[PDB]
Protein backbone atom coordinates (compact mmCIF):
# COMPACT_ATOMS: atom_id res chain seq x y z
CA UNK A 1 0.00 0.00 0.00
CA UNK A 2 1.47 3.31 -1.08
CA UNK A 3 1.40 6.86 0.24
CA UNK A 4 -1.89 8.36 1.37
CA UNK A 5 -2.67 11.09 -1.13
CA UNK A 6 -5.96 12.29 0.38
CA UNK A 7 -5.00 13.23 3.91
CA UNK A 8 -4.70 16.85 4.85
CA UNK A 9 -1.28 18.22 5.62
CA UNK A 10 -0.91 20.97 8.14
CA UNK A 11 -0.11 24.27 6.51
CA UNK A 12 -0.99 22.94 3.07
CA UNK A 13 -3.99 23.97 1.09
CA UNK A 14 -3.96 20.64 -0.80
CA UNK A 15 -5.01 17.91 -0.80
CA UNK A 16 -8.42 19.41 -0.11
CA UNK A 17 -11.72 17.63 0.41
CA UNK A 18 -14.71 19.23 -1.28
CA UNK A 19 -18.46 18.57 -1.41
CA UNK A 20 -21.33 19.77 -3.52
CA UNK A 21 -23.20 20.59 -0.28
CA UNK A 22 -22.96 19.84 3.41
CA UNK A 23 -24.75 20.03 6.71
CA UNK A 24 -22.80 23.08 7.96
CA UNK A 25 -21.74 21.61 11.31
CA UNK A 26 -20.40 18.56 9.37
CA UNK A 27 -17.93 20.23 6.99
CA UNK A 28 -16.29 18.07 4.32
CA UNK A 29 -12.84 18.86 5.72
CA UNK A 30 -13.81 16.17 8.24
CA UNK A 31 -13.33 13.46 5.67
CA UNK A 32 -9.54 13.77 5.32
CA UNK A 33 -8.56 14.91 8.81
CA UNK A 34 -7.15 11.47 9.86
CA UNK A 35 -9.83 11.17 12.58
CA UNK A 36 -12.17 8.22 12.15
CA UNK A 37 -15.28 8.07 14.31
CA UNK A 38 -18.46 6.05 13.91
CA UNK A 39 -20.24 7.71 16.83
CA UNK A 40 -20.53 11.05 18.61
CA UNK A 41 -17.54 10.65 20.91
CA UNK A 42 -16.36 12.59 19.02
CA UNK A 43 -18.67 13.34 16.16
CA UNK A 44 -16.42 13.54 13.12
CA UNK A 45 -18.09 13.34 9.73
CA UNK A 46 -19.26 15.00 6.60
CA UNK A 47 -23.00 14.69 6.09
CA UNK A 48 -25.69 16.33 4.03
CA UNK A 49 -28.18 15.71 6.88
CA UNK A 50 -31.38 17.73 6.42
CA UNK A 51 -30.10 19.46 3.27
CA UNK A 52 -32.37 20.13 0.33
CA UNK A 53 -30.76 17.90 -2.33
CA UNK A 54 -30.88 14.17 -1.64
CA UNK A 55 -27.83 13.76 -3.89
CA UNK A 56 -24.40 15.12 -3.00
CA UNK A 57 -20.77 14.41 -3.89
CA UNK A 58 -17.63 14.33 -1.79
CA UNK A 59 -14.21 14.31 -3.34
CA UNK A 60 -10.53 15.11 -3.05
CA UNK A 61 -8.58 17.66 -5.04
CA UNK A 62 -4.96 16.48 -5.05
CA UNK A 63 -1.79 18.27 -4.14
CA UNK A 64 1.98 17.63 -4.11
CA UNK A 65 4.13 19.66 -1.78
CA UNK A 66 1.48 22.28 -1.25
CA UNK A 67 0.42 22.88 -4.81
CA UNK A 68 -2.09 21.39 -7.20
CA UNK A 69 -1.11 18.03 -8.77
CA UNK A 70 -2.51 15.36 -10.86
CA UNK A 71 -2.25 11.92 -9.37
CA UNK A 72 -2.55 8.40 -10.67
CA UNK A 73 -5.58 6.94 -8.87
CA UNK A 74 -6.99 3.46 -8.82
CA UNK A 75 -8.70 3.21 -5.45
CA UNK A 76 -10.92 4.91 -2.90
CA UNK A 77 -11.91 3.92 0.58
CA UNK A 78 -14.91 5.41 2.38
CA UNK A 79 -15.91 5.02 5.98
CA UNK A 80 -19.65 5.42 6.06
CA UNK A 81 -21.30 6.43 9.32
CA UNK A 82 -24.87 5.84 10.42
CA UNK A 83 -27.22 7.00 13.14
CA UNK A 84 -31.04 7.57 13.21
CA UNK A 85 -30.66 10.41 10.73
CA UNK A 86 -27.93 9.43 8.29
CA UNK A 87 -26.18 6.45 6.75
CA UNK A 88 -24.62 4.90 3.68
CA UNK A 89 -26.22 6.04 0.39
CA UNK A 90 -28.63 3.90 -1.60
CA UNK A 91 -26.77 4.58 -4.86
CA UNK A 92 -23.50 6.19 -5.98
CA UNK A 93 -21.18 6.85 -8.84
CA UNK A 94 -17.42 7.30 -8.55
CA UNK A 95 -16.06 9.87 -11.02
CA UNK A 96 -12.84 11.52 -12.04
CA UNK A 97 -12.07 14.97 -13.30
CA UNK A 98 -11.33 15.35 -17.04
CA UNK A 99 -11.90 19.06 -17.64
CA UNK A 100 -9.34 20.91 -19.69
CA UNK A 101 -9.63 23.80 -17.27
CA UNK A 102 -7.20 23.33 -14.39
CA UNK A 103 -9.42 23.34 -11.25
CA UNK A 104 -8.98 25.98 -8.58
CA UNK A 105 -9.52 25.30 -4.89
CA UNK A 106 -13.20 26.10 -4.22
CA UNK A 107 -13.74 29.24 -2.18
CA UNK A 108 -16.15 27.34 0.05
CA UNK A 109 -15.18 23.66 -0.26
CA UNK A 110 -18.10 22.24 1.75
CA UNK A 111 -20.55 23.99 -0.60
CA UNK A 112 -19.11 23.84 -4.12
CA UNK A 113 -22.60 23.88 -5.62
CA UNK A 114 -23.09 27.43 -4.29
CA UNK A 115 -20.25 28.92 -6.37
CA UNK A 116 -19.10 29.03 -9.99
CA UNK A 117 -16.70 26.16 -10.32
CA UNK A 118 -15.62 23.61 -12.92
CA UNK A 119 -16.64 20.86 -10.60
CA UNK A 120 -20.30 21.74 -11.05
CA UNK A 121 -20.19 21.02 -14.85
CA UNK A 122 -20.97 17.35 -15.50
CA UNK A 123 -18.92 17.57 -18.77
CA UNK A 124 -15.85 17.77 -16.58
CA UNK A 125 -16.38 14.33 -15.02
CA UNK A 126 -16.31 10.77 -16.25
CA UNK A 127 -17.18 7.61 -14.36
CA UNK A 128 -14.41 5.28 -13.27
CA UNK A 129 -14.23 2.01 -15.26
CA UNK A 130 -14.17 -1.59 -14.11
CA UNK A 131 -15.22 -0.71 -10.65
CA UNK A 132 -14.82 -3.27 -7.97
CA UNK A 133 -16.95 -2.37 -4.95
CA UNK A 134 -18.55 -4.02 -2.01
CA UNK A 135 -21.75 -5.91 -2.89
CA UNK A 136 -23.43 -3.74 -0.27
CA UNK A 137 -22.13 -0.64 1.41
CA UNK A 138 -21.79 -0.91 5.14
CA UNK A 139 -21.62 1.72 7.79
CA UNK A 140 -19.05 1.17 10.50
CA UNK A 141 -16.02 0.28 8.41
CA UNK A 142 -13.84 1.51 5.53
CA UNK A 143 -15.55 0.42 2.31
CA UNK A 144 -12.96 -0.23 -0.38
CA UNK A 145 -13.29 0.56 -4.09
CA UNK A 146 -10.85 -0.11 -6.92
CA UNK A 147 -11.01 0.83 -10.57
CA UNK A 148 -8.88 1.33 -13.61
CA UNK A 149 -6.06 3.76 -13.02
CA UNK A 150 -6.67 7.40 -14.10
CA UNK A 151 -4.43 10.47 -14.00
CA UNK A 152 -6.59 13.22 -12.57
CA UNK A 153 -6.70 16.36 -10.41
CA UNK A 154 -9.73 15.00 -8.48
CA UNK A 155 -12.01 12.16 -7.81
CA UNK A 156 -15.39 12.26 -6.18
CA UNK A 157 -18.11 9.95 -5.03
CA UNK A 158 -21.62 11.22 -5.93
CA UNK A 159 -24.30 9.73 -3.78
CA UNK A 160 -28.05 9.58 -3.23
CA UNK A 161 -29.25 9.19 0.34
CA UNK A 162 -31.22 6.22 1.53
CA UNK A 163 -34.97 6.83 1.56
CA UNK A 164 -35.23 6.12 5.26
CA UNK A 165 -32.49 8.64 6.13
CA UNK A 166 -32.22 12.42 6.12
CA UNK A 167 -28.68 12.30 4.60
CA UNK A 168 -25.51 10.48 3.66
CA UNK A 169 -22.60 10.35 6.04
CA UNK A 170 -18.81 9.76 5.86
CA UNK A 171 -16.28 9.90 8.72
CA UNK A 172 -13.17 9.54 6.47
CA UNK A 173 -12.05 8.78 2.98
CA UNK A 174 -8.62 7.45 2.04
CA UNK A 175 -6.93 7.35 -1.36
CA UNK A 176 -3.49 5.72 -1.90
CA UNK A 177 -0.71 6.06 -4.42
CA UNK A 178 0.68 2.95 -6.09
CA1 LIG B 1 -12.46 12.22 9.62
Author numbering: 1466 to 1643
Provide the publication's sentences verbatim.
BgaA is specific for galactose β-1,4-linked to glucose or GlcNAc [lactose or N-acetyllactosamine (LacNAc) motifs, respectively] found in glycoconjugates. The N-terminal region of BgaA comprising amino acid residues 138–993 has amino acid sequence identity with GH family 2 enzymes. Through detailed structural and functional analyses the molecular basis for the catalytic specificity of BgaA is defined and this activity is demonstrated as critical for the ability of pneumococci to utilize complex N-linked glycans as a carbon source and protect the bacterium from opsonophagocytic killing. Further analyses also revealed the presence of non-catalytic CBMs within the C-terminal region of BgaA that mediate adherence to host cell surface LacNAc and/or lactose.
However, fold prediction using the Phyre2 server, which does not rely on amino acid sequence similarity, distinguished two regions (XII and XV) with a high probability of adopting the β-sandwich fold common to many CBMs found in CAZymes. The two predicted CBMs were recombinantly produced and the polypeptides screened for binding to all commonly occurring monosaccharides by UV difference spectroscopy; only D-galactose gave a signature UV difference spectrum consistent with sugar binding. Subsequently, this approach was expanded to the relevant galactose-containing sugars LacNAc, lactose, galactopyranosyl-β-1,3-N-acetyl-D-glucosamine (lacto-N-biose), and galactopyranosyl-β-1,3-N-acetyl-D-galactosamine [Thomsen-Freidenreich (TF) epitope] and binding was only observed to LacNAc and lactose. Significantly, the CBMs only bound with significant affinity to sugars that are substrates for the catalytic domain. A single bound metal ion was modeled as Ca2+ on the basis of coordination geometry and B-factor analysis. The shallow LacNAc binding site sits at the apex of the β-fold opposite the N- and C-termini. Tryptophan 1514 lies directly beneath the glycoside bond and coplanar with the disaccharide thus providing CH-π interactions with both pyranose rings and a higher affinity for β-linked disaccharides than for galactose alone. This binding site architecture accommodates lactose and LacNAc, but would limit the recognition of other sugars terminating in β-linked galactose.
